[PDB]
Amino acid sequence: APWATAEYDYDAAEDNELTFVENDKIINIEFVDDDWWLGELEKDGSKGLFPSNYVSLGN
């Protein structure tokens, strides 16, 4: 799946959101939702919905 990088220290506002800190790499991205995609952190392997606007897609 697509991948993305974090641009802001995101602290998952709703619980089942993902959480990352700037320059954080995200992978295995999916289009679970138009606005919140799902991830997998390449650095730690964490998955969760994230507000695509808090991150930039590397694809």
Binding site: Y10, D11, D15, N16, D35, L49
Partner: peptide, 18 residues
Amino acid sequence: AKKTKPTPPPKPSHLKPK
């Protein structure tokens, strides 16, 4: 806390715990 991060926009209500 952070000072410079977008506001996590709405969330499709079908993607919440439980």
